[PDB]
Amino acid sequence: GITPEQLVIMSKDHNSGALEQYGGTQGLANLLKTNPEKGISGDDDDLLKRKTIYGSNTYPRKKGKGFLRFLWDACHDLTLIILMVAAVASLALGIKTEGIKEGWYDGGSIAFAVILVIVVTAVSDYKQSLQFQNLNDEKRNIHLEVLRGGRRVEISIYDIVVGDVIPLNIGNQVPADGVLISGHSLALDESSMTGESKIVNKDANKDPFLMSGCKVADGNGSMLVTGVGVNTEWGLLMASISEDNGEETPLQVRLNGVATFIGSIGLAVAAAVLVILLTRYFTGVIDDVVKVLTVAVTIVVVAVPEGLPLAVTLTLAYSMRKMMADKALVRRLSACETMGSATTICSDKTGTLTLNQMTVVESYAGGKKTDTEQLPATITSLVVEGISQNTTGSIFVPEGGGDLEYSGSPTEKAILGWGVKLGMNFETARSQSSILHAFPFNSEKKRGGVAVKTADGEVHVHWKGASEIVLASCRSYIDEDGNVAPMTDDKASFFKNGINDMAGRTLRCVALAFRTYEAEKVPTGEELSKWVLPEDDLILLAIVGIKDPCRPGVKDSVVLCQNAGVKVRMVTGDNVQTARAIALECGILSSDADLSEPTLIEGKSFREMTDAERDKISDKISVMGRSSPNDKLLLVQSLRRQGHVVAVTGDGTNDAPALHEADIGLAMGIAGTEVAKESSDIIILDDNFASVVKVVRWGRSVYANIQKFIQFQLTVNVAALVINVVAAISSGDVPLTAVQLLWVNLIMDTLGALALATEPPTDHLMGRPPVGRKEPLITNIMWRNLLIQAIYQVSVLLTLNFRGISILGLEHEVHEHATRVKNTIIFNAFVLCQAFNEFNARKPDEKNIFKGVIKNRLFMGIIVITLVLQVIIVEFLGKFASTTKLNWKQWLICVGIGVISWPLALVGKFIPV
Ligand SMILES: [Mg+2]
DSSP states (O other): OOSSSHHHHHHHSOTTSSTTTTTHHHHTTTSTTOOSSOSSOSSSHHHHHHHHHSOOSOOOOOOOOSSSHHHHHHHTOHHHHHHHHHHHHHHHHHHHHHOOOOOSHHHHHHHHHHHHHHHHHHHHHHHHHHHHHHHHOOOOOOOBOOOSTTOSOSBOGGGOOTTOEEEEOTTOEEOSEEEEEEEEEEEEEGGGTTOOSSOEEOOSSSSOOBOSSEEEEEEEEEEEEEEOGGGSHHHHHHHTTOOOOSOOOHHHHHHHHHHHHHHHHHHHHHHHHHHHHHHHHHHOOOOSHHHHHHHHHHHHHHHSOSSHHHHHHHHHHHHHHHHHHTTEEESSTTHHHHTTTOOEEEEOSSSSSBOSSOEEEEEOBBTBOOOSSOOOHHHHHHHHHHHHHTOSOOBSOTTTOSOOOBOSOHHHHHHHHHHHHTTOOHHHHHTTEEEEEEEOOOSSSOOEEEEEEESSSSEEEEEEEEHHHHHHTEEEEEBTTSOEEEOOHHHHHHHHHHHHHHHHSSOOOEEEEEEOOOSOOTTTSSOSTTOOOOOSSEEEEEEEEEEOOBOTTOHHHHHHHHHTTOEEEEEOSSOHHHHHHHHHHHTSSOSTTSSOTTTBOOHHHHHHSOTTTTSTTTTTOOEEOSOOHHHHHHHHHHHHHTTOOEEEEEOSGGGHHHHHHSSEEEEETTTSOHHHHHTOSEEETTOSSHHHHHHHHHHHHHHHHHHHHHHHHHHHHHHHHHHHHHHHHHHSOOSSOHHHHHHIIIIIHHHHHHHHHTSOOOTHHHHSOOOOSSSOSSOHHHHHHHHHHHHHHHHHHHHHHHHHHHHSSSTTSSHHHHHHHHHHHHHHHHHHHHHHHHHHHHSOSSOOOOOOOHHHHHHHHHHHHHHHHHHHOOSSSSTTTTOOOOOHHHHHHHHHHHHTHHHHHHHHHHOOO
């Protein structure tokens, strides 16, 4: 018909490309039923047609927690699945073995383990998700008139449809993709969508293309909307990020591997025991096979780590809470760890690593650079009056007394920030001075002039403009702390060289001058516009250079990140020169190999290569300018294909694909766009890089704590498996009942995990490089430690299980009572050995300092008191553990058996054996 989605092609094509084939912006009128006076026909069918054919501006919104989804995700844990199958088996087998079919104590503990895991994960993730939903919800959209025949004024941005001409002013936000149909020096801030720091100047013929989700930095004009909804570049980017799948955290896969290994070992050994013992029974209605089967499922239960999911969830939740105590928010528990293993960090430039606000970086004043610092009073007074009386923009709340917020174009904002830094107060600066005449900033005439009648009789003429023309129009200057001085040829050459060097860097160049011409008044003149405002013999005050600078204290953070083995690179859509300058300032890119192709490549060069040939180079890309969002996605994909655990810190919508495809996507809390924050696993509410370093440290500490608990849990499981298997083959009885060890796993894990988690992160973790993504979760040192502890426990508990009635005093006064007492001694000595092994694991690979934290002591007291209560009283607690009362001598024997763990733990720590 007439632009049936050909308009998406028009926008896709190069700037000012393919728009001439359609007759230009005006030719596009009468197409899409657009009239410059009437953007919409009077009827509503004329709007429904645009809603249907060209779509609607509403973007679909993702929905989470639809129906207990997080509980299902928790249930999908592989180790948890092993636990569920073992739990069902044991419950049915025991309930048939006893035949009572009353109560749920036999499998109650094993069911409660997974129930607790599910509940804890669901609660923690629900809280985190709702908190993130509340925080990230930012009303960036600004509702405005649509300007179509003066009808349906002030409709929400979601009601704008293709074919209607909407107006845009300074500070507004471009709602939908469009082409400007008229304007007055309009200029957009596309840094959100394209990543270019400098504002883009839009013309009705040169660059007639306005992008959705853009901030109008300067000027104003009316624009025809072309793309709305998914058809927009914003919409298309949001569409190319929806699909998420094939993800598994390195920690998650490592835990799955360890759980699968231990579970397979347990299953194999239990099956061997079952087969051998059945052969013994048959040859060595029901034939007592049920008792053997309950023994076998008990062995299988003690084999698998029941409390591992509980401990990992508790550690991740505690570390997420501690991170949120800092100014970094983690969306999911798993992410809390994945950032520790990150091997490279790709950081946006505009918004991330740079304030994104133009401000003065250097300056000139009194014949000297005198960058920032504090200017002399004599020159400072004139400079501040000129900055106050020659700027259209103004500070938001000088009268109110709150934090100052600047307005106007980035040039005006930076000049005003400089004036404020110099000690200017806008309320008073504007006072004591009346603007007789004001010729504002003009594209035709670069300079901007003003006439200020100071409180004194004489009147000043201020000129703020481009450095070259202002300098050419001035023949004198105000030297430091002194009166006017003629500018000699050498001084003019010095100023011009300074301006040229300043322009060599990314920063722009704005110069201020003042002429003391007086004795005449603009009001006395018949017409203010007729005031020539003479431009001759000006006196230069201070040349000022304004650029988008690196965030404060970002170079040091990058230095720390690099020291931690985590390389940092920059992926940005800004031109190569600006990216190179900002990288050098921020420390990402060192001085050497600055211009080499691998060190910095443009987006087009990177994408030209095949996905196979985008990998031999992706390992060296330190900077990347003019990179499209798909090029950021390609870089992330290539880095991941090479085995990197890529983190991406970005703010704009262009970074959304890179954030999503990345292993760990970090998004700035305030600067970040809604799309970037949605696709990020962590959103940095600090808007700072020190928070990123802290997050890396917290992830490494989380991994260390998980490793320590894994050591402890493997010790417990491998001691109990041996004890039960040997006891079953030797006599057919299991000392460690299923419920006893289920309680041990549950309580000891849920308490010791957080007890070790109390260890605050230490800078030591930053010294070592990141984990290799392939090293086993259980390092050989942890294997030796857990093996030594498990061997000791096996030895003591087996010698007890076999000779305890004789070894323990008061031997066999009643055989059943003596057997129960011996089993209780074995069980609670096992518990105490586990507690003291937790003590050891708190500070591994060194001599224990034996100085715990208050919370650790409190939880040790809790463990001791709960164990003592469980053993000592058999009613309402200890019924299921089947434990008989113990006398003081027996309890002393148990605490001695536990204490013996510490010396051998130390010996194993200090001996490679
Ligand atoms: Mg950005």
